[PDB]
Every structure is written in structure tokens, then in C-alpha cells.
PDB file of C-alpha atoms and ligand atoms in Angstrom:
ATOM      1  CA  UNK F   1      73.165  96.747  88.683  1.00 35.06           C
ATOM      2  CA  UNK F   2      74.736  98.528  91.766  1.00 34.86           C
ATOM      3  CA  UNK F   3      77.593 100.698  90.483  1.00 34.73           C
ATOM      4  CA  UNK F   4      80.831 102.322  91.713  1.00 33.40           C
ATOM      5  CA  UNK F   5      81.747 105.981  91.365  1.00 31.70           C
ATOM      6  CA  UNK F   6      84.577 106.722  89.074  1.00 27.14           C
ATOM      7  CA  UNK F   7      84.805 110.345  90.341  1.00 24.61           C
ATOM      8  CA  UNK F   8      87.716 110.906  92.610  1.00 22.47           C
ATOM      9  CA  UNK F   9      88.999 114.276  93.976  1.00 23.48           C
ATOM     10  CA  UNK F  10      92.702 113.378  93.316  1.00 22.03           C
ATOM     11  CA  UNK F  11      92.411 112.023  89.737  1.00 22.21           C
ATOM     12  CA  UNK F  12      91.707 114.434  86.869  1.00 18.83           C
ATOM     13  CA  UNK F  13      90.583 112.902  83.496  1.00 19.82           C
ATOM     14  CA  UNK F  14      90.683 114.092  79.841  1.00 21.64           C
ATOM     15  CA  UNK F  15      93.493 116.588  80.555  1.00 22.60           C
ATOM     16  CA  UNK F  16      96.818 115.994  78.768  1.00 24.30           C
ATOM     17  CA  UNK F  17      99.401 116.182  81.617  1.00 25.12           C
ATOM     18  CA  UNK F  18     101.924 117.254  78.938  1.00 27.83           C
ATOM     19  CA  UNK F  19     100.208 120.635  78.637  1.00 28.88           C
ATOM     20  CA  UNK F  20     100.931 121.338  82.285  1.00 28.54           C
ATOM     21  CA  UNK F  21     104.209 119.515  82.929  1.00 31.43           C
ATOM     22  CA  UNK F  22     107.387 119.436  80.932  1.00 29.45           C
ATOM     23  CA  UNK F  23     109.383 116.174  81.215  1.00 27.08           C
ATOM     24  CA  UNK F  24     112.977 117.117  81.872  1.00 27.35           C
ATOM     25  CA  UNK F  25     114.436 113.626  82.564  1.00 30.87           C
ATOM     26  CA  UNK F  26     114.048 110.079  83.759  1.00 27.82           C
ATOM     27  CA  UNK F  27     114.356 109.020  87.362  1.00 25.62           C
ATOM     28  CA  UNK F  28     113.510 105.283  87.154  1.00 25.11           C
ATOM     29  CA  UNK F  29     112.026 102.552  84.942  1.00 28.67           C
ATOM     30  CA  UNK F  30     110.226  99.771  86.807  1.00 32.61           C
ATOM     31  CA  UNK F  31     107.936  96.926  85.941  1.00 29.04           C
ATOM     32  CA  UNK F  32     104.924  99.206  86.339  1.00 31.41           C
ATOM     33  CA  UNK F  33     106.336 102.101  84.361  1.00 30.35           C
ATOM     34  CA  UNK F  34     108.723 105.023  84.068  1.00 35.62           C
ATOM     35  CA  UNK F  35     109.187 107.729  86.642  1.00 33.70           C
ATOM     36  CA  UNK F  36     110.020 111.054  85.051  1.00 35.08           C
ATOM     37  CA  UNK F  37     111.319 114.331  86.464  1.00 36.64           C
ATOM     38  CA  UNK F  38     108.893 117.054  85.520  1.00 34.93           C
ATOM     39  CA  UNK F  39     108.815 120.854  85.624  1.00 33.41           C
ATOM     40  CA  UNK F  40     105.570 122.837  85.824  1.00 31.80           C
ATOM     41  CA  UNK F  41     105.207 125.033  82.709  1.00 33.23           C
ATOM     42  CA  UNK F  42     103.556 127.884  84.599  1.00 35.38           C
ATOM     43  CA  UNK F  43     105.620 127.943  87.834  1.00 36.89           C
ATOM     44  CA  UNK F  44     108.904 125.986  87.464  1.00 36.13           C
ATOM     45  CA  UNK F  45     107.946 123.761  90.434  1.00 35.57           C
ATOM     46  CA  UNK F  46     109.389 120.269  90.302  1.00 30.81           C
ATOM     47  CA  UNK F  47     107.755 116.881  90.453  1.00 29.64           C
ATOM     48  CA  UNK F  48     108.317 113.188  90.073  1.00 31.20           C
ATOM     49  CA  UNK F  49     105.723 111.734  87.595  1.00 29.27           C
ATOM     50  CA  UNK F  50     105.077 107.956  87.795  1.00 30.98           C
ATOM     51  CA  UNK F  51     103.378 106.906  84.592  1.00 29.59           C
ATOM     52  CA  UNK F  52     101.490 103.586  84.174  1.00 32.11           C
ATOM     53  CA  UNK F  53      99.755 102.002  81.179  1.00 32.36           C
ATOM     54  CA  UNK F  54      96.989 100.384  83.177  1.00 32.77           C
ATOM     55  CA  UNK F  55      95.524  97.299  81.588  1.00 28.78           C
ATOM     56  CA  UNK F  56      92.321  96.571  83.558  1.00 28.12           C
ATOM     57  CA  UNK F  57      89.690  98.818  85.165  1.00 26.13           C
ATOM     58  CA  UNK F  58      90.342  96.679  88.296  1.00 24.57           C
ATOM     59  CA  UNK F  59      94.023  97.588  88.186  1.00 24.30           C
ATOM     60  CA  UNK F  60      93.177 101.263  87.657  1.00 22.44           C
ATOM     61  CA  UNK F  61      90.862 101.054  90.619  1.00 25.93           C
ATOM     62  CA  UNK F  62      93.481  99.428  92.860  1.00 27.01           C
ATOM     63  CA  UNK F  63      95.979 102.129  92.021  1.00 26.89           C
ATOM     64  CA  UNK F  64      93.539 104.962  92.512  1.00 25.94           C
ATOM     65  CA  UNK F  65      92.617 103.641  95.975  1.00 24.18           C
ATOM     66  CA  UNK F  66      96.352 103.942  96.829  1.00 25.67           C
ATOM     67  CA  UNK F  67      96.526 107.433  95.388  1.00 26.47           C
ATOM     68  CA  UNK F  68      93.514 108.460  97.473  1.00 25.76           C
ATOM     69  CA  UNK F  69      95.105 106.938 100.577  1.00 21.88           C
ATOM     70  CA  UNK F  70      98.290 108.947  99.905  1.00 23.15           C
ATOM     71  CA  UNK F  71      96.245 112.090  99.434  1.00 23.26           C
ATOM     72  CA  UNK F  72      95.274 111.831 103.130  1.00 25.50           C
ATOM     73  CA  UNK F  73      98.863 111.345 104.320  1.00 27.06           C
ATOM     74  CA  UNK F  74      99.817 114.933 105.208  1.00 26.67           C
ATOM     75  CA  UNK F  75     102.953 114.272 107.257  1.00 28.44           C
ATOM     76  CA  UNK F  76     106.329 115.987 106.878  1.00 27.66           C
ATOM     77  CA  UNK F  77     108.229 112.703 106.332  1.00 28.82           C
ATOM     78  CA  UNK F  78     105.904 111.142 103.714  1.00 30.70           C
ATOM     79  CA  UNK F  79     106.037 112.025  99.972  1.00 31.58           C
ATOM     80  CA  UNK F  80     103.548 114.696  99.088  1.00 29.54           C
ATOM     81  CA  UNK F  81     101.011 113.817  96.412  1.00 29.75           C
ATOM     82  CA  UNK F  82     100.327 116.669  94.138  1.00 28.65           C
ATOM     83  CA  UNK F  83      97.731 114.736  92.320  1.00 26.70           C
ATOM     84  CA  UNK F  84      97.053 112.253  89.571  1.00 27.63           C
ATOM     85  CA  UNK F  85      95.915 112.223  85.979  1.00 27.15           C
ATOM     86  CA  UNK F  86      94.349 109.571  83.893  1.00 26.81           C
ATOM     87  CA  UNK F  87      94.818 110.371  80.228  1.00 30.39           C
ATOM     88  CA  UNK F  88      95.203 108.284  77.060  1.00 30.06           C
ATOM     89  CA  UNK F  89      95.180 105.047  78.988  1.00 29.11           C
ATOM     90  CA  UNK F  90      97.989 106.392  81.217  1.00 29.86           C
ATOM     91  CA  UNK F  91      97.741 106.997  84.972  1.00 28.70           C
ATOM     92  CA  UNK F  92     100.157 109.773  85.974  1.00 27.50           C
ATOM     93  CA  UNK F  93     101.048 110.088  89.645  1.00 26.20           C
ATOM     94  CA  UNK F  94     102.671 113.454  90.467  1.00 23.66           C
ATOM     95  CA  UNK F  95     104.777 113.734  93.680  1.00 23.32           C
ATOM     96  CA  UNK F  96     106.709 116.702  95.073  1.00 20.67           C
ATOM     97  CA  UNK F  97     110.284 116.269  93.753  1.00 19.94           C
ATOM     98  CA  UNK F  98     112.814 115.092  96.415  1.00 18.27           C
ATOM     99  CA  UNK F  99     116.072 116.118  94.834  1.00 18.70           C
ATOM    100  CA  UNK F 100     118.348 113.980  96.963  1.00 16.93           C
ATOM    101  CA  UNK F 101     117.032 110.717  95.537  1.00 16.95           C
ATOM    102  CA  UNK F 102     116.852 107.391  97.332  1.00 15.46           C
ATOM    103  CA  UNK F 103     119.067 106.281 100.183  1.00 13.79           C
ATOM    104  CA  UNK F 104     120.119 103.019  98.480  1.00 14.35           C
ATOM    105  CA  UNK F 105     121.043 104.883  95.249  1.00 14.81           C
ATOM    106  CA  UNK F 106     123.198 107.141  97.417  1.00 13.33           C
ATOM    107  CA  UNK F 107     124.853 104.090  99.040  1.00 17.57           C
ATOM    108  CA  UNK F 108     125.588 102.494  95.649  1.00 17.16           C
ATOM    109  CA  UNK F 109     126.975 105.780  94.278  1.00 15.44           C
ATOM    110  CA  UNK F 110     129.389 106.210  97.191  1.00 12.88           C
ATOM    111  CA  UNK F 111     129.839 102.437  97.528  1.00 11.58           C
ATOM    112  CA  UNK F 112     129.251 102.538 101.305  1.00 13.19           C
ATOM    113  CA  UNK F 113     126.655 102.222 104.015  1.00 10.63           C
ATOM    114  CA  UNK F 114     125.290 104.922 106.266  1.00 12.87           C
ATOM    115  CA  UNK F 115     127.048 105.817 109.465  1.00 12.47           C
ATOM    116  CA  UNK F 116     125.113 104.997 112.602  1.00 12.36           C
ATOM    117  CA  UNK F 117     124.214 108.695 113.117  1.00 13.93           C
ATOM    118  CA  UNK F 118     122.755 108.785 109.578  1.00 13.90           C
ATOM    119  CA  UNK F 119     120.832 105.560 110.300  1.00 12.67           C
ATOM    120  CA  UNK F 120     119.537 107.207 113.536  1.00 15.14           C
ATOM    121  CA  UNK F 121     117.871 110.115 111.704  1.00 11.19           C
ATOM    122  CA  UNK F 122     116.399 107.889 109.023  1.00 11.73           C
ATOM    123  CA  UNK F 123     115.090 105.483 111.665  1.00 13.45           C
ATOM    124  CA  UNK F 124     113.623 108.291 113.747  1.00 11.19           C
ATOM    125  CA  UNK F 125     111.908 109.945 110.814  1.00 12.40           C
ATOM    126  CA  UNK F 126     110.669 106.625 109.390  1.00 12.23           C
ATOM    127  CA  UNK F 127     109.104 105.675 112.744  1.00 13.46           C
ATOM    128  CA  UNK F 128     107.322 108.992 112.937  1.00 14.32           C
ATOM    129  CA  UNK F 129     106.054 108.419 109.410  1.00 13.81           C
ATOM    130  CA  UNK F 130     104.958 104.902 110.389  1.00 14.65           C
ATOM    131  CA  UNK F 131     103.375 105.829 113.682  1.00 13.39           C
ATOM    132  CA  UNK F 132     101.304 108.349 111.758  1.00 16.58           C
ATOM    133  CA  UNK F 133     100.227 105.924 109.034  1.00 15.73           C
ATOM    134  CA  UNK F 134      99.376 103.126 111.504  1.00 15.12           C
ATOM    135  CA  UNK F 135      97.226 105.486 113.561  1.00 16.61           C
ATOM    136  CA  UNK F 136      95.204 106.288 110.451  1.00 15.05           C
ATOM    137  CA  UNK F 137      94.977 102.432 109.937  1.00 12.46           C
ATOM    138  CA  UNK F 138      97.337 102.478 106.958  1.00 10.68           C
ATOM    139  CA  UNK F 139      99.792  99.631 106.482  1.00  7.76           C
ATOM    140  CA  UNK F 140     102.719 100.711 104.308  1.00 11.66           C
ATOM    141  CA  UNK F 141     103.561  97.213 102.998  1.00 12.09           C
ATOM    142  CA  UNK F 142     106.584  98.356 100.911  1.00  9.53           C
ATOM    143  CA  UNK F 143     109.349  99.565 103.242  1.00  9.13           C
ATOM    144  CA  UNK F 144     112.945  99.327 102.031  1.00  8.21           C
ATOM    145  CA  UNK F 145     115.946 101.705 101.564  1.00  6.76           C
ATOM    146  CA  UNK F 146     114.607 102.394  98.017  1.00  4.28           C
ATOM    147  CA  UNK F 147     111.562 104.058  99.535  1.00  2.37           C
ATOM    148  CA  UNK F 148     113.553 106.513 101.558  1.00  4.63           C
ATOM    149  CA  UNK F 149     113.832 109.643  99.476  1.00  6.56           C
ATOM    150  CA  UNK F 150     115.931 112.623 100.529  1.00  6.39           C
ATOM    151  CA  UNK F 151     115.400 116.383 100.418  1.00  7.47           C
ATOM    152  CA  UNK F 152     118.262 118.929 100.284  1.00  4.34           C
ATOM    153  CA  UNK F 153     117.437 120.081 103.823  1.00  2.00           C
ATOM    154  CA  UNK F 154     118.262 116.548 105.130  1.00  2.00           C
ATOM    155  CA  UNK F 155     114.814 115.131 105.890  1.00  2.00           C
ATOM    156  CA  UNK F 156     113.411 111.937 104.432  1.00  2.00           C
ATOM    157  CA  UNK F 157     110.226 111.616 102.475  1.00  2.00           C
ATOM    158  CA  UNK F 158     108.898 108.049 102.719  1.00  2.00           C
ATOM    159  CA  UNK F 159     107.627 106.843  99.334  1.00  2.00           C
ATOM    160  CA  UNK F 160     104.391 104.861  99.314  1.00  2.00           C
ATOM    161  CA  UNK F 161     105.951 102.793  96.558  1.00  2.00           C
ATOM    162  CA  UNK F 162     109.527 102.499  95.385  1.00  2.00           C
ATOM    163  CA  UNK F 163     112.024 100.306  93.547  1.00  2.00           C
ATOM    164  CA  UNK F 164     115.423  99.115  94.845  1.00  2.00           C
ATOM    165  CA  UNK F 165     118.433 100.758  93.092  1.00  2.00           C
ATOM    166  CA  UNK F 179     111.913  91.943  93.046  1.00  2.00           C
ATOM    167  CA  UNK F 180     113.176  89.456  95.656  1.00  2.00           C
ATOM    168  CA  UNK F 181     111.242  89.966  98.890  1.00  2.00           C
ATOM    169  CA  UNK F 182     114.073  90.609 101.367  1.00  2.00           C
ATOM    170  CA  UNK F 183     111.938  92.681 103.672  1.00  2.00           C
ATOM    171  CA  UNK F 184     109.057  90.258 104.073  1.00  2.00           C
ATOM    172  CA  UNK F 185     107.858  89.540 107.647  1.00  2.00           C
ATOM    173  CA  UNK F 186     107.905  85.956 108.868  1.00  2.00           C
ATOM    174  CA  UNK F 187     104.127  86.062 109.583  1.00  2.00           C
ATOM    175  CA  UNK F 188     103.560  86.817 105.944  1.00  2.00           C
ATOM    176  CA  UNK F 189     106.098  84.116 104.947  1.00  2.00           C
ATOM    177  CA  UNK F 190     104.564  81.434 107.316  1.00  2.00           C
ATOM    178  CA  UNK F 199      97.667  92.040 107.154  1.00  2.00           C
ATOM    179  CA  UNK F 200      98.655  93.920 110.307  1.00  2.00           C
ATOM    180  CA  UNK F 201     100.677  96.976 111.175  1.00  2.00           C
ATOM    181  CA  UNK F 202     103.405  94.883 112.811  1.00  2.00           C
ATOM    182  CA  UNK F 203     104.722  93.616 109.514  1.00  2.00           C
ATOM    183  CA  UNK F 204     105.930  97.176 108.753  1.00  2.00           C
ATOM    184  CA  UNK F 205     108.062  97.097 111.916  1.00  2.00           C
ATOM    185  CA  UNK F 206     109.908  93.952 110.738  1.00  2.00           C
ATOM    186  CA  UNK F 207     110.549  95.515 107.369  1.00  2.00           C
ATOM    187  CA  UNK F 208     111.927  98.644 109.064  1.00  2.00           C
ATOM    188  CA  UNK F 209     114.370  96.434 110.932  1.00  2.00           C
ATOM    189  CA  UNK F 210     115.451  94.850 107.661  1.00  2.00           C
ATOM    190  CA  UNK F 211     115.772  98.309 106.103  1.00  2.00           C
ATOM    191  CA  UNK F 212     118.129  99.473 108.826  1.00  2.00           C
ATOM    192  CA  UNK F 213     120.489  96.515 108.273  1.00  2.00           C
ATOM    193  CA  UNK F 214     120.208  97.338 104.547  1.00  2.00           C
ATOM    194  CA  UNK F 215     121.375 100.886 105.334  1.00  2.00           C
ATOM    195  CA  UNK F 216     124.097  99.652 107.670  1.00  2.00           C
ATOM    196  CA  UNK F 217     125.469  97.169 105.094  1.00  2.05           C
ATOM    197  CA  UNK F 218     124.257  98.445 101.677  1.00  2.00           C
ATOM    198  CA  UNK F 219     122.501  95.171 100.913  1.00  2.00           C
ATOM    199  CA  UNK F 220     119.776  93.510 102.949  1.00  2.00           C
ATOM    200  CA  UNK F 221     120.228  90.143 104.674  1.00  2.00           C
ATOM    201  CA  UNK F 222     120.359  87.159 102.343  1.00  2.25           C
ATOM    202  CA  UNK F 223     121.438  89.247  99.351  1.00  3.87           C
ATOM    203  CA  UNK F 224     123.994  86.582  98.520  1.00  4.22           C
ATOM    204  CA  UNK F 225     121.498  83.725  98.202  1.00  2.19           C
ATOM    205  CA  UNK F 226     119.692  82.231  95.262  1.00  5.66           C
ATOM    206  CA  UNK F 227     116.625  84.469  95.215  1.00  5.54           C
ATOM    207  CA  UNK F 228     114.501  81.285  95.041  1.00  8.16           C
ATOM    208  CA  UNK F 229     115.704  80.518  98.618  1.00  6.15           C
ATOM    209  CA  UNK F 230     115.094  83.867 100.292  1.00  4.09           C
ATOM    210  CA  UNK F 231     111.584  83.174 101.643  1.00  5.95           C
ATOM    211  CA  UNK F 232     112.640  79.686 102.781  1.00  7.96           C
ATOM    212  CA  UNK F 233     115.582  81.220 104.607  1.00  6.13           C
ATOM    213  CA  UNK F 234     113.433  83.819 106.343  1.00 11.02           C
ATOM    214  CA  UNK F 235     111.125  81.101 107.618  1.00  8.87           C
ATOM    215  CA  UNK F 236     113.768  78.687 108.910  1.00  9.60           C
ATOM    216  CA  UNK F 237     116.361  81.176 110.215  1.00  6.84           C
ATOM    217  CA  UNK F 238     116.722  83.100 113.433  1.00  6.20           C
ATOM    218  CA  UNK F 239     116.227  86.831 112.931  1.00  3.00           C
ATOM    219  CA  UNK F 240     119.138  88.549 111.194  1.00  6.67           C
ATOM    220  CA  UNK F 241     121.766  90.545 113.081  1.00  4.61           C
ATOM    221  CA  UNK F 242     124.419  93.057 112.034  1.00  6.30           C
ATOM    222  CA  UNK F 243     127.484  91.385 110.408  1.00  5.05           C
ATOM    223  CA  UNK F 244     130.120  93.289 112.435  1.00  8.14           C
ATOM    224  CA  UNK F 245     128.392  94.026 115.808  1.00  6.23           C
ATOM    225  CA  UNK F 246     131.442  95.750 117.363  1.00  8.28           C
ATOM    226  CA  UNK F 247     131.115  98.472 114.676  1.00  7.61           C
ATOM    227  CA  UNK F 248     127.722  99.487 116.098  1.00  5.52           C
ATOM    228  CA  UNK F 249     126.343 100.779 119.365  1.00  6.28           C
ATOM    229  CA  UNK F 250     124.600  98.702 122.035  1.00  7.93           C
ATOM    230  CA  UNK F 251     121.508 100.878 121.365  1.00  7.89           C
ATOM    231  CA  UNK F 252     121.426  99.958 117.673  1.00 11.38           C
ATOM    232  CA  UNK F 253     121.881  96.202 118.279  1.00  9.25           C
ATOM    233  CA  UNK F 254     119.107  96.299 120.902  1.00 10.76           C
ATOM    234  CA  UNK F 255     116.745  98.232 118.604  1.00 10.93           C
ATOM    235  CA  UNK F 256     117.180  95.537 115.907  1.00 12.13           C
ATOM    236  CA  UNK F 257     116.857  92.702 118.393  1.00  9.29           C
ATOM    237  CA  UNK F 258     113.429  93.885 119.449  1.00  9.56           C
ATOM    238  CA  UNK F 259     112.207  95.154 116.058  1.00 10.57           C
ATOM    239  CA  UNK F 260     113.256  91.860 114.363  1.00 11.57           C
ATOM    240  CA  UNK F 261     110.955  89.734 116.597  1.00 13.54           C
ATOM    241  CA  UNK F 262     109.522  86.798 114.586  1.00 12.45           C
ATOM    242  CA  UNK F 263     106.389  86.906 116.662  1.00 11.94           C
ATOM    243  CA  UNK F 264     104.251  89.850 115.546  1.00 11.23           C
ATOM    244  CA  UNK F 265     102.371  89.833 118.922  1.00  9.72           C
ATOM    245  CA  UNK F 266     105.491  90.593 121.003  1.00  8.68           C
ATOM    246  CA  UNK F 267     107.037  92.763 118.305  1.00  9.70           C
ATOM    247  CA  UNK F 268     106.836  96.394 119.452  1.00  7.85           C
ATOM    248  CA  UNK F 269     104.712  99.085 117.792  1.00  8.54           C
ATOM    249  CA  UNK F 270     106.104 102.141 116.038  1.00  7.00           C
ATOM    250  CA  UNK F 271     104.909 104.179 119.020  1.00  8.37           C
ATOM    251  CA  UNK F 272     106.899 101.958 121.382  1.00  8.55           C
ATOM    252  CA  UNK F 273     110.033 102.086 119.185  1.00  9.50           C
ATOM    253  CA  UNK F 274     109.959 105.948 119.145  1.00  9.08           C
ATOM    254  CA  UNK F 275     110.761 105.759 122.893  1.00 12.11           C
ATOM    255  CA  UNK F 276     113.793 103.480 122.415  1.00 14.78           C
ATOM    256  CA  UNK F 277     117.078 105.102 123.371  1.00 11.53           C
ATOM    257  CA  UNK F 278     118.364 104.602 119.809  1.00 10.16           C
ATOM    258  CA  UNK F 279     115.975 107.272 118.526  1.00  6.76           C
ATOM    259  CA  UNK F 280     114.237 108.911 121.534  1.00  6.02           C
ATOM    260  CA  UNK F 281     116.818 111.726 121.668  1.00  5.74           C
ATOM    261  CA  UNK F 282     117.249 112.329 117.939  1.00  3.68           C
ATOM    262  CA  UNK F 283     116.262 115.910 117.194  1.00  2.99           C
ATOM    263  CA  UNK F 284     118.680 117.038 114.440  1.00  2.00           C
ATOM    264  CA  UNK F 285     118.958 115.977 110.789  1.00  2.00           C
ATOM    265  CA  UNK F 286     122.548 117.133 110.372  1.00  2.00           C
ATOM    266  CA  UNK F 287     124.167 113.684 109.844  1.00  2.00           C
ATOM    267  CA  UNK F 288     121.875 113.062 106.897  1.00  2.00           C
ATOM    268  CA  UNK F 289     122.088 116.591 105.533  1.00  2.00           C
ATOM    269  CA  UNK F 290     125.854 115.990 105.175  1.00  2.00           C
ATOM    270  CA  UNK F 291     125.322 112.675 103.336  1.00  2.00           C
ATOM    271  CA  UNK F 292     123.124 114.320 100.669  1.00  2.00           C
ATOM    272  CA  UNK F 293     125.697 117.131 100.328  1.00  2.00           C
ATOM    273  CA  UNK F 294     128.452 114.543  99.690  1.00  2.00           C
ATOM    274  CA  UNK F 295     126.428 112.547  97.191  1.00  2.00           C
ATOM    275  CA  UNK F 296     125.677 115.799  95.346  1.00  2.00           C
ATOM    276  CA  UNK F 297     129.389 116.440  94.671  1.00  2.00           C
ATOM    277  CA  UNK F 298     130.153 112.879  93.469  1.00  2.00           C
ATOM    278  CA  UNK F 299     127.595 112.868  90.605  1.00  2.00           C
TER     279      UNK F 299
HETATM  280  C1  GW8 X 301     102.463  96.817  94.716  1.00  2.00           C
HETATM  281  N1  GW8 X 301     101.871  97.727  93.670  1.00  2.00           N
HETATM  282  C2  GW8 X 301     102.903  98.037  92.638  1.00  2.00           C
HETATM  283  C3  GW8 X 301     102.251  98.925  91.622  1.00  2.00           C
HETATM  284  N2  GW8 X 301     101.786 100.207  92.301  1.00  2.00           N
HETATM  285  C4  GW8 X 301     102.078 101.426  91.778  1.00  2.00           C
HETATM  286  O1  GW8 X 301     102.762 101.540  90.741  1.00  2.00           O
HETATM  287  C5  GW8 X 301     101.554 102.583  92.404  1.00  2.00           C
HETATM  288  C6  GW8 X 301     100.162 102.719  92.445  1.00  2.00           C
HETATM  289  C7  GW8 X 301      99.561 103.804  93.062  1.00  2.00           C
HETATM  290  C8  GW8 X 301     100.344 104.813  93.653  1.00  2.00           C
HETATM  291  C9  GW8 X 301     101.736 104.754  93.567  1.00  2.00           C
HETATM  292  N3  GW8 X 301     102.511 105.732  94.153  1.00  2.00           N
HETATM  293  C10 GW8 X 301     103.639 106.192  93.532  1.00  2.00           C
HETATM  294  O2  GW8 X 301     103.937 105.887  92.362  1.00  2.00           O
HETATM  295  N4  GW8 X 301     104.374 107.079  94.293  1.00  2.00           N
HETATM  296  C11 GW8 X 301     105.570 107.568  93.910  1.00  2.00           C
HETATM  297  C12 GW8 X 301     106.543 107.587  94.899  1.00  2.00           C
HETATM  298  C13 GW8 X 301     107.810 108.049  94.663  1.00  2.00           C
HETATM  299  C14 GW8 X 301     108.144 108.513  93.406  1.00  2.00           C
HETATM  300  N5  GW8 X 301     109.409 108.923  93.154  1.00  2.00           N
HETATM  301  C15 GW8 X 301     110.367 107.956  92.530  1.00  2.00           C
HETATM  302  C16 GW8 X 301     109.908 110.090  93.573  1.00  2.00           C
HETATM  303  C17 GW8 X 301     109.124 111.015  94.213  1.00  2.00           C
HETATM  304  C18 GW8 X 301     109.691 112.198  94.584  1.00  2.00           C
HETATM  305  N6  GW8 X 301     111.006 112.415  94.301  1.00  2.00           N
HETATM  306  C19 GW8 X 301     111.751 111.487  93.694  1.00  2.00           C
HETATM  307  N7  GW8 X 301     113.036 111.811  93.543  1.00  2.00           N
HETATM  308  C20 GW8 X 301     113.983 111.102  92.926  1.00  2.00           C
HETATM  309  C21 GW8 X 301     115.085 111.823  92.480  1.00  2.00           C
HETATM  310  C22 GW8 X 301     116.180 111.237  91.876  1.00  2.00           C
HETATM  311  C23 GW8 X 301     116.200 109.872  91.732  1.00  2.00           C
HETATM  312  C24 GW8 X 301     117.269 109.243  91.073  1.00  2.00           C
HETATM  313  S1  GW8 X 301     118.486 108.584  92.226  1.00  2.00           S
HETATM  314  C25 GW8 X 301     119.483 109.895  92.851  1.00  2.00           C
HETATM  315  O3  GW8 X 301     119.315 107.673  91.330  1.00  2.00           O
HETATM  316  O4  GW8 X 301     117.960 107.718  93.399  1.00  2.00           O
HETATM  317  C26 GW8 X 301     115.115 109.133  92.196  1.00  2.00           C
HETATM  318  C27 GW8 X 301     114.024 109.724  92.786  1.00  2.00           C
HETATM  319  N8  GW8 X 301     111.187 110.367  93.303  1.00  2.00           N
HETATM  320  C28 GW8 X 301     107.213 108.480  92.399  1.00  2.00           C
HETATM  321  C29 GW8 X 301     105.918 108.042  92.639  1.00  2.00           C
HETATM  322  C30 GW8 X 301     102.319 103.602  92.965  1.00  2.00           C
HETATM  323  C31 GW8 X 301     101.015 100.063  93.539  1.00  2.00           C
HETATM  324  C32 GW8 X 301     101.394  98.881  94.437  1.00  2.00           C
HETATM  325 CL1   CL X 302      98.624 117.740  89.601  1.00  2.00          CL
HETATM  326 CL1   CL X 303     118.133  78.252 102.819  1.00  2.00          CL
HETATM  327 CL1   CL X 304     119.303 100.149 124.907  1.00  2.00          CL
HETATM  328 CL1   CL X 305     100.882  98.096 116.040  1.00  2.00          CL
END
């Protein structure tokens, strides 16, 4: 019969990752597996290792397609794939360690939302990340505060996949009832999440969230007077229920809320603060 290649440039087989990487801690433990912190035995370089016991060869294949997609995302605000291993029934995904951790974990630690200037840098950097992915025909499909990882320098790295610190709060109304516009809606939801710690409809019975997205007007900030006219306008247009009229990432990058954002300082200070509290 016609057959598929199992040779991929970014997946190495029959090599024990544990000969190359030392596990020095745990960063997360999701439904798909643990994420470890790892240190390279030869160089001391740091990585996140996401480790999955893949059941089916179909599953393995789906994941590897995603790894190979990530391998082509060379952008300064997207996590950097080192590479992957498949060993002993375990798929290891190695990413360049972002030591600041995830924005929502930072919010929960400090028990507060981001200032608007912090939200401005994250929004700006996310849109650049998105504009890049969409132009390579990549839909992210997984945007939320839990996917925004932080470096010490104060830049984001957008994670292809992440876990909140799974009710689908960020789902686009078109998907509720595959196109780049759905990522824009989820960005909008993510910004409210960063403004208010929790995304809209956090209080509801999770069984009602999708219903509520479908029937409701788009969500708005809870205390509008706390936020600039720019920010409220950005949300208004990003959170358009009609994907046709919803603006692209390219169009959003020219919105006054982010068009002038050139410095990461606001965010750099947030990571510094969260570093002292731990
Ligand atoms: C829909 N399905 C579900 C099943 N599915 C997959 O499973 C899947 C399939 C193929 C590819 C991938 N890609 C990845 O797995 N990428 C990846 C992305 C990010 C990281 N992490 C977590 C990284 C990366 C870098 N740095 C950190 N720093 C860090 C430091 C400290 C703290 C702690 S704190 C301070 O408390 O927040 C946390 C983090 N974490 C690891 C791996 C996933 C595919 C789609
Ligand atoms: Cl590697
Ligand atoms: Cl409802
Ligand atoms: Cl405006
Ligand atoms: Cl688009």
C-alpha cells in the first residue's frame, strides 16, 4: 500500500533524552503529560521538556506535525523549539526555557491583573507573533494568558500549546455557532483575562460557557473607567462576533493602542516583581 514517511528532521528516535538532559524540576502537569525543567549535561543550557506517553501512531503523527510546524516558526516572540525526541513510547518536546513563566501564573502569584501598559506590550508582541504565523498560513488555535511565557529581558514567547494556571473561555463565536480570524477573538479574550485575572464567564457553570458565548453580546471590561479609550476601542473591534468584519492581526498592529509601543519596560518590571515574591 502507499505509505507515509516516519523520518522527520525535528524528531530524533532511539536516543535516551536522559543521557543529554538532566531533569532539574517540574513546571506543569497537564492532561497530556508533565513539563519538566531540564539542564543540558554538556552545556548547562536550559529547556522546558514536555513529555507525552502517546497511545496511537495517529496521535504521534498529529503531534509531530505540530512540532514540525513550530520548527518553522523562527520569530522572536514565539517559543523556540530545540527539537523533539521519541524514545520508549515517550515524545519529548524541548523548548528554550523562558524563566519568567506564564503571565496568568504571575497574576495568580501577585493576586492582581496587569496594568494597561503591561497589557500594551503583551498585546503588541502577541500581534506581531500572530501576524507572522497567519502569513505563513498557521492558525494558533490555543491563545490564552497561559500561553504567554516571559523572559527575564521582558519579552514574551508565545507558546504553541499551554495550560491555564479545560473550559473553552477563549472560543470564537464562529466556532461555537478554521480561519485566522478566530485567533483575533481569542486575543481579545486574553486581554480581558490579563486585565481582570480571569476570563469572561469564569463565574459560570462551565457547562454554560459555550451557550453564553453564543447568546451574549461580546464581552467588555468590567470597570471601563479604569482603562483608556484606546484599550476599550481595541477590544470593541477585536471582539467582533462576525469573523468577516473582525480585523486582521495586520490591521490591529496599526491601532493606536499598540501602534506606538516600542519598549518592553512595563513588562520587564512585572517579571522582576514576580521574581522577588517567590
Ligand atoms: C490540542 N492538543 C493538545 C495536545 N498537544 C500537545 O501536547 C502538543 C503537541 C505537539 C507540540 C506541543 N508543543 C509543546 O508542548 N510546546 C511547549 C510549549 C511551552 C512549554 N513550556 C511550558 C515552556 C516552555 C518554555 N519555558 C517555560 N517556562 C516555564 C517556566 C516556569 C513555569 C512555572 S510558572 C512561573 O508557575 O508559570 C512555567 C513555564 N515553559 C512546553 C512545551 C504540544 C497538541 C495539541
Ligand atoms: Cl534537542
Ligand atoms: Cl447562559
Ligand atoms: Cl482609538
Ligand atoms: Cl486574517
